[PDB]
Write an enzyme that holds these catalytic residues in place. Structure first.
Site, short mmCIF file in Angstrom:
data_model
loop_
_atom_site.label_atom_id
_atom_site.label_comp_id
_atom_site.label_asym_id
_atom_site.label_seq_id
_atom_site.Cartn_x
_atom_site.Cartn_y
_atom_site.Cartn_z
N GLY A 62 -11.14 1.76 3.43
CA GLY A 62 -11.32 3.08 2.84
C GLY A 62 -12.77 3.36 2.49
O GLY A 62 -13.20 4.50 2.54
N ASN A 110 -6.88 9.54 -4.56
CA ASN A 110 -7.31 10.08 -3.27
C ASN A 110 -6.14 10.50 -2.39
O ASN A 110 -5.06 9.88 -2.41
CB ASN A 110 -8.20 9.05 -2.55
N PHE A 114 -6.16 9.87 6.08
CA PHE A 114 -6.68 9.18 7.29
C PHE A 114 -7.69 10.02 8.10
O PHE A 114 -7.54 10.16 9.32
CB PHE A 114 -5.55 8.79 8.28
N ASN A 146 -8.79 -2.24 9.98
CA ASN A 146 -7.55 -1.69 9.49
C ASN A 146 -7.15 -0.50 10.38
O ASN A 146 -7.92 0.45 10.54
CB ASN A 146 -7.76 -1.29 8.02
N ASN A 177 -1.57 -1.09 8.58
CA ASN A 177 -1.47 -0.34 7.37
C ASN A 177 -0.27 0.53 7.44
O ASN A 177 -0.31 1.61 8.03
CB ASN A 177 -2.70 0.56 7.20
N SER A 180 -0.23 3.71 3.39
CA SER A 180 -0.90 4.90 2.84
C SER A 180 0.12 5.86 2.22
O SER A 180 1.12 6.18 2.86
CB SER A 180 -1.67 5.67 3.91
N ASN A 182 -0.48 8.88 1.87
CA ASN A 182 -0.99 10.19 2.31
C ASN A 182 -0.75 10.55 3.78
O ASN A 182 -1.42 11.43 4.33
CB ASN A 182 -2.48 10.32 1.99
N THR A 183 0.21 9.86 4.40
CA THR A 183 0.72 10.25 5.71
C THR A 183 2.25 10.25 5.65
O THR A 183 2.87 9.22 5.37
CB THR A 183 0.19 9.32 6.84
N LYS A 220 -0.36 -4.60 5.54
CA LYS A 220 -0.76 -4.13 4.22
C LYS A 220 0.36 -3.30 3.59
O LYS A 220 0.81 -2.29 4.16
CB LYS A 220 -2.04 -3.30 4.29
N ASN A 249 -1.88 -1.61 -1.33
CA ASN A 249 -2.46 -0.26 -1.23
C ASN A 249 -2.41 0.45 -2.59
O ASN A 249 -2.06 -0.16 -3.64
CB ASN A 249 -1.71 0.56 -0.15
C1 LIG Z 1 -10.99 6.67 -1.58
C2 LIG Z 1 -9.95 5.68 -1.10
C3 LIG Z 1 -9.66 5.62 0.27
C4 LIG Z 1 -8.87 4.60 0.78
N1 LIG Z 1 -8.57 4.57 2.14
C5 LIG Z 1 -7.80 3.54 2.66
C6 LIG Z 1 -7.51 3.46 4.04
O1 LIG Z 1 -8.13 4.14 4.90
N2 LIG Z 1 -6.74 2.41 4.48
C7 LIG Z 1 -6.22 1.46 3.61
O2 LIG Z 1 -5.54 0.54 4.04
N3 LIG Z 1 -6.48 1.54 2.27
C8 LIG Z 1 -7.29 2.55 1.78
N4 LIG Z 1 -7.56 2.60 0.43
C9 LIG Z 1 -6.89 1.64 -0.53
C10 LIG Z 1 -7.82 0.45 -0.82
O3 LIG Z 1 -8.07 -0.30 0.36
C11 LIG Z 1 -7.17 -0.48 -1.87
O4 LIG Z 1 -5.96 -1.04 -1.34
C12 LIG Z 1 -6.83 0.25 -3.18
O5 LIG Z 1 -7.73 1.29 -3.53
C13 LIG Z 1 -6.72 -0.74 -4.35
O6 LIG Z 1 -7.96 -1.42 -4.56
P1 LIG Z 1 -9.00 -0.88 -5.69
O7 LIG Z 1 -8.25 -0.66 -6.97
O8 LIG Z 1 -10.05 -1.97 -5.85
O9 LIG Z 1 -9.65 0.42 -5.23
C14 LIG Z 1 -8.36 3.62 -0.07
C15 LIG Z 1 -8.66 3.67 -1.44
C16 LIG Z 1 -9.46 4.68 -1.95
C17 LIG Z 1 -9.93 4.57 -3.38
O1 LIG Z 2 -5.75 8.96 2.32
C1 LIG Z 2 -6.14 7.94 2.97
O2 LIG Z 2 -6.82 7.98 4.01
C2 LIG Z 2 -5.63 6.63 2.43
C3 LIG Z 2 -5.63 6.53 1.05
C4 LIG Z 2 -5.11 5.39 0.47
O3 LIG Z 2 -5.14 5.31 -0.77
N1 LIG Z 2 -4.61 4.40 1.25
C5 LIG Z 2 -4.60 4.52 2.58
O4 LIG Z 2 -4.13 3.59 3.26
N2 LIG Z 2 -5.11 5.64 3.19
#
Ligand SMILES: Cc1cc2nc3c(=O)[nH]c(=O)nc-3n(C[C@H](O)[C@H](O)[C@H](O)COP(=O)(O)O)c2cc1C
Ligand SMILES: O=C(O)c1cc(=O)[nH]c(=O)[nH]1
Ligand SMILES: C/C(O)=C(\C#N)C(=O)Nc1ccc(-c2ccccc2Cl)c(Cl)c1
EC number: 1.3.5.2
Length: 361
Positions: A62, A110, A114, A146, A177, A180, A182-183, A220, A249
């Site tokens: 992310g 957030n 994707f 990922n 993954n 998410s 958000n899908t 994940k 996640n």
């Molecule tokens: C802004 C944002 C975008 C993210 N996008 C993805 C994503 O594209 N794919 C994914 O597997 N996790 C995504 N994550 C989740 C993080 O990889 C992580 O699993 C989650 O935020 C928990 O860790 P943290 O508390 O240290 O942020 C995203 C998280 C945030 C904050």
């Molecule tokens: O919105 C994304 O792209 C996204 C957010 C998130 O928290 N986790 C994830 O896997 N994707």
């Protein structure tokens, strides 16, 4: 280059000047250019997933969705970098605003949805530094990729399969993954029959890659799963020989006690309010897999104690993202220094000795 200056002055000033998406975009830019503010001890080295990791602290997916800042992230002190999620075709993701800081809760919400430059763009970006990465990997600095799916895709399994074919040859590990928030429909791939069929296809595709280009495959998962869901995932993971789990996640829950004005925004919640829900999920997954399936623990890691709690619960490695958005790059060194000191204090020879230690008391 100071933890206090970043925490008290730089980051709050940034928050007052820029909206969070803009601050993130600027972060990626600065990082990609190596414009950044600790010496890894042998104690922090971990061997898992067919690789040496010189320290167990990775950047979570992310932050670098499109593989633009990989080298800058190693410079920042991460023991491993995960990019993505990457979708087969480019897509824009959701309309803005789609990211929100809750500073009173040390949390983020957030709903990016994707946003991705797509497989082809990321493939060429990684190819440009493929040999540089081979050396980094050999040096204990592996790269994860990922994989996501496109919003309008009919065949989720084929999207993931495409990602294996295109970026598998460039990754030390791949992440399916399926978590998410958000899908639409994505997390339902976490169910048993769906998951088995999906993962069988993904592993077939991975197995078809030449040996030097053959990555580990991890799944994940969400922090919001039912007991039945977790039980089913553990069963499938063991049945198929899935290489590891990433736990967790973001959460769709909104724990009682959130103070941020933006707490009721739609999306996944990360940072401190996620921390212990994540740790308990690691704990449950480790037990259900008999400690035989490496886990990367993620969610609310902002200190050495946070890291070690996940490690003791069953994580072989950890990742963070949200902590960076509040404390900036010095948080990486902080976490590593604190973790080392705690390992010594608790009588562990190294990180390896602490993995799953709670389960043995
Ligand atoms: C802004 C944002 C975008 C993210 N996008 C993805 C994503 O594209 N794919 C994914 O597997 N996790 C995504 N994550 C989740 C993080 O990889 C992580 O699993 C989650 O935020 C928990 O860790 P943290 O508390 O240290 O942020 C995203 C998280 C945030 C904050
Ligand atoms: O919105 C994304 O792209 C996204 C957010 C998130 O928290 N986790 C994830 O896997 N994707
Ligand atoms: C909302 C928000 O600030 C972010 C998100 N998502 C984010 O990544 N912030 C951020 C801003 C600056 C930096 C940063 C990058 C390179 C050099 C110095 C800094 Cl403070 C980082 Cl590491 C993260």
């Amino acid at each position: 280059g100071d933890e206090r200056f970043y925490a008290e002055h730089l980051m709050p000033t940034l928050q007052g000047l820029l909206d969070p998406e803009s601050a993130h975009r600027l972060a990626v830019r600065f990082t990609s250019l190596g414009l950044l503010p600790f010496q890894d001890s042998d104690m922090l080295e971990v061997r898992v997933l067919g690789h040496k990791f010189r320290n167990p602290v990775g950047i979570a997916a992310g932050f670098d969705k499109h593989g633009e800042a990989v080298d800058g992230l190693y410079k920042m002190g991460f023991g491993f970098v995960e990019i993505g999620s990457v979708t087969p075709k480019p897509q824009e993701g959701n309309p803005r605003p789609r990211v929100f800081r809750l500073p009173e809760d040390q949390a983020v919400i957030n709903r990016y949805g994707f946003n991705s430059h797509g497989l082809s763009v990321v493939e060429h970006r990684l190819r440009a530094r493929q040999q540089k990465q081979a050396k980094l990997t050999e040096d204990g600095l592996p790269l994860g990729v990922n994989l996501g799916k496109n919003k309008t895709s009919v065949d989720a399994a084929e999207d993931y399969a495409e990602g294996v074919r295109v970026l598998g040859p460039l990754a030390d590990y791949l992440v399916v993954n399926v978590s998410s928030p958000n899908t639409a429909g994505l997390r339902s791939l976490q169910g048993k029959a769906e998951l088995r069929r999906l993962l069988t296809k993904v592993l077939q595709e991975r197995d078809g890659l030449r040996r030097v280009h053959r990555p580990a495959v991890l799944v994940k998962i969400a922090p919001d799963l039912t007991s039945q869901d977790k039980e089913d995932i553990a069963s499938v993971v063991k049945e198929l020989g899935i290489d590891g789990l990433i736990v967790t996640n973001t959460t769709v829950s909104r724990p009682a006690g959130l103070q941020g004005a933006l707490r009721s925004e739609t999306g996944g919640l990360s940072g401190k309010p996620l921390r212990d829900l994540s740790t308990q999920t690691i704990r449950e997954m480790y037990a259900l897999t008999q400690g035989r399936v490496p886990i990367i623990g993620v969610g609310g890691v902002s200190s050495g104690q946070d890291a070690l709690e996940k490690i003791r619960a069953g994580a072989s490695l950890v990742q963070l993202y949200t902590a960076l958005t509040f404390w900036g790059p010095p948080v990486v060194g902080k976490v590593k220094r604190e973790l080392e000191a705690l390992l010594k204090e608790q009588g562990f020879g190294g990180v390896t000795d602490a993995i799953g230690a709670d389960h043995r008391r």
